[PDB]
Amino acid sequence: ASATRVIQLLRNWASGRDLQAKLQLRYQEISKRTQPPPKLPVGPSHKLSNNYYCTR
Amino acid sequence: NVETVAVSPTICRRGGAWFASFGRERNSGTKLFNISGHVNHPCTVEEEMSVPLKELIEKHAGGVIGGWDNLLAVIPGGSSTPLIPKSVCETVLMDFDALVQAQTGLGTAAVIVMDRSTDIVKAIARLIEFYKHESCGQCTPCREGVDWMNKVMARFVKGDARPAEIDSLWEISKQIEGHTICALGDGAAWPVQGLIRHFRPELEERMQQFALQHQ
Ligand SMILES: Cc1cc2nc3c(=O)[nH]c(=O)nc-3n(C[C@H](O)[C@H](O)[C@H](O)COP(=O)(O)O)c2cc1C
Ligand code: SF4
């Protein structure tokens, strides 16, 4: 937040707690909107043998 | 078979007991043997039934090429019978029951030998390709599964697969064996089973070599 120090002091005194530590407006601290590709592992029954369906 | 009817009149003429003298109980008689592959003198010969394989090769066939220590594997009863290694063929008899004890069976008494200077995977793949060519294909297991096994062996020969597939191939054979109409499916499943059971390390090493060289 680009708020002047006097306004920050006024708001902190009025609320009684330090507002600048935990702001309710989201900033560059959030995750990027473009992400690497995932891999998403397979399940446990993706075996090639000893995987007869009558047993599961 | 030709041999059965051919020996029947001589059995009748000389008596049943004379034929029953040779071989063991429930394995009586004399048998025609073909010895082929890596031997000094490949030949056909009539011999007493329960003759040990080693003396049969060393006597009539002239011995394995390069000596007995050069031997790698032997198929005792033709392509249908599974192969066996040197360790069990050192002291094995040649009849139905003793070969069943070696998990193979006598079959047609067609001995095919392979020394240590050959690709056993290539030979078994050739046998599976032959079975793929010679199946009539009326029933789904033999037709589809034998083509599948032929493809899997062709892929094994160059090591293009991964070890987790080997067990899969085993399973495929068990699906063909006993579910077809005739015994051609059994005779195509057995060689793969024997090759896997006795030389899984060879297949694994070939796969590792392929994976390393192709990266
Ligand atoms: C695919 C296949 C091919 C066969 N080819 C022959 C053959 O060429 N000669 C033969 O005597 N038996 C062959 N058999 C086995 C026959 O079933 C067998 O000859 C028949 O049962 C009578 O044989 P026997 O004289 O031992 O009673 C073959 C079996 C299969 C499944
Ligand atoms: S198992 Fe016998 S009947 Fe079935 S497809 Fe093969 S050769 Fe034909």
Side-chain angles (χ1 to χ4, degrees):
Chain A
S2 63
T4 64
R5 55 150 268 159
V6 63
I7 284 305
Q8 299 183 6
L9 294 174
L10 175 68
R11 69 172 70 174
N12 283 352
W13 170 84
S15 69
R17 65 209 60 211
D18 179 47
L19 261 50
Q20 297 300 112
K22 286 160 153 176
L23 282 163
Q24 61 195 107
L25 296 193
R26 275 160 321 155
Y27 285 104
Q28 288 261 279
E29 61 86 19
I30 79 169
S31 66
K32 300 289 94 175
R33 319 297 280 151
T34 299
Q35 300 284 338
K39 197 62 172 32
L40 294 175
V42 294
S45 296
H46 269 65
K47 293 187 286 185
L48 282 196
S49 67
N50 192 255
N51 202 32
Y52 282 85
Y53 186 78
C54 55
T55 67
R56 47 185 186 89
Chain B
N1 185 271
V2 180
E3 187 176 359
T4 306
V5 289
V7 302
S8 66
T10 310
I11 287 173
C12 284
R13 185 178 296 113
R14 303 182 49 92
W18 163 86
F19 206 67
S21 69
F22 302 108
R24 297 185 297 171
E25 293 179 353
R26 294 173 291 110
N27 294 258
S28 61
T30 61
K31 184 83 194 59
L32 284 172
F33 297 93
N34 298 134
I35 298 98
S36 164
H38 294 151
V39 294
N40 294 320
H41 311 89
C43 67
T44 186
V45 56
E46 183 178 1
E47 174 77 278
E48 200 172 7
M49 192 85 198
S50 294
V51 54
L53 188 153
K54 177 204 258 196
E55 79 173 6
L56 175 61
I57 301 299
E58 285 168 340
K59 167 162 212 54
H60 305 287
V64 190
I65 296 172
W68 186 255
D69 264 16
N70 201 28
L71 185 63
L72 160 71
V74 63
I75 307 173
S79 297
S80 179
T81 57
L83 57 85
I84 58 172
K86 167 197 275 288
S87 71
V88 65
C89 84
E90 281 274 32
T91 54
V92 75
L93 302 177
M94 185 64 73
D95 53 352
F96 301 97
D97 299 282
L99 269 180
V100 172
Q101 285 324 310
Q103 323 164 300
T104 293
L106 170 66
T108 184
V111 189
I112 307 153
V113 305
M114 293 141 270
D115 53 55
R116 266 181 302 102
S117 44
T118 188
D119 200 353
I120 187 163
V121 177
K122 171 89 210 94
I124 301 307
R126 191 49 177 94
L127 292 180
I128 298 313
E129 169 180 355
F130 157 84
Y131 274 114
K132 177 245 175 189
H133 276 317
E134 303 284 337
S135 83
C136 68
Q138 70 162 348
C139 70
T140 67
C142 176
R143 169 181 72 231
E144 308 283 306
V146 161
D147 208 351
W148 192 353
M149 290 198 327
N150 181 212
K151 276 175 175 168
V152 169
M153 305 297 321
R155 211 174 62 231
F156 283 171
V157 164
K158 60 179 71 177
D160 195 44
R162 69 190 144 270
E165 311 208 35
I166 289 173
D167 303 272
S168 173
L169 188 58
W170 184 273
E171 297 203 345
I172 300 298
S173 69
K174 306 305 286 186
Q175 282 176 8
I176 299 170
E177 181 208 314
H179 298 96
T180 66
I181 292 183
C182 82
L184 194 143
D186 291 331
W190 288 324
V192 166
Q193 284 175 35
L195 168 81
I196 286 172
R197 175 204 307 125
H198 283 126
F199 307 75
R200 195 194 185 97
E202 166 72 35
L203 300 161
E204 281 166 346
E205 182 65 26
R206 190 182 297 273
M207 283 173 215
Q208 303 171 321
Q209 207 69 279
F210 180 89
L212 281 188
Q213 189 273 324
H214 282 53
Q215 299 106 24

